[PDB]
Design a protein around this ligand. Sequence first.
Ligand SMILES: CC(=O)N[C@H]1[C@@H](OP(=O)(O)OP(=O)(O)OC[C@H]2O[C@@H](n3ccc(=O)[nH]c3=O)[C@H](O)[C@@H]2O)O[C@H](CO)[C@H](O)[C@@H]1O
Length: 241
Amino acid sequence: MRIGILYICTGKYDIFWKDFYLSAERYFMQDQSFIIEYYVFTDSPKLYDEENNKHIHRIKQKNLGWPDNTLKRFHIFLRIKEQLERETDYLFFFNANLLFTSPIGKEILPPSDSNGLLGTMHPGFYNKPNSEFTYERRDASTAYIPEGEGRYYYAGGLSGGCTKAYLKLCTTICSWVDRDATNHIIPIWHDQSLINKYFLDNPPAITLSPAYLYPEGWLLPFEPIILIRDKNKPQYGGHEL
Ligand SMILES: CC(=O)N[C@H]1[C@@H](OP(=O)(O)OP(=O)(O)OC[C@H]2O[C@@H](n3ccc(=O)[nH]c3=O)[C@H](O)[C@@H]2O)O[C@H](CO)[C@H](O)[C@@H]1O
């Protein structure tokens, strides 16, 4: 089947796209059943390595800067809503600085009988209890959730599921941020604080171990599968804006 993979890279984050694109081929979508379709949102005219592979689709999108670039990601997925219904069956989002290390496959695709959602544990909060989750604790916010509840702390570096179930997600949170905008609030950990609520209302069919979000340099009780490139390396410099 045809699986769609969402990817955002604006400003200088187009430096991350390449090693990701190559790694995606080596490891993602290996066995013939599956065909990969890149949906890239960039300011830039040119994306590596284009021309050559049809599937990859460059989608024009300007720079909104921090924090709007991760806050309004879901409005970015809806500019092309109708397109995602005819050309895709499953959806996924990968962080710009992600990288593949070990093969992937059908193990991450939600069963069709379930809700059809996917989340991933956060690498820093997988060994911690509810007391330490960094949700949003302001009542007037749509991302408000108090103490003693919430099962996990999901990260926004990876999320997906069936196209239907994921678009409804995209459409849901789009209102939630917009509603906050009229209430004059910006959530603390905007991509996540919003998402964690949604995964609280409707917990994903799958929760992926932080092996799929492996920070570089770290020592975890896991085998690397998908990796997080370290931004404070002198090649990247923390700062892109
Ligand atoms: C996994 C995690 O807990 N990390 C945080 C953050 O990672 P970091 O704060 O470590 O990285 P970041 O916020 O610079 O990256 C945000 C991601 O959004 C996209 N992008 C692209 C171009 C651009 O100009 N700005 C931009 O934000 C891009 O794919 C990038 O990977 O981002 C995650 C992805 O949502 C979450 O939101 C969290 O806030």
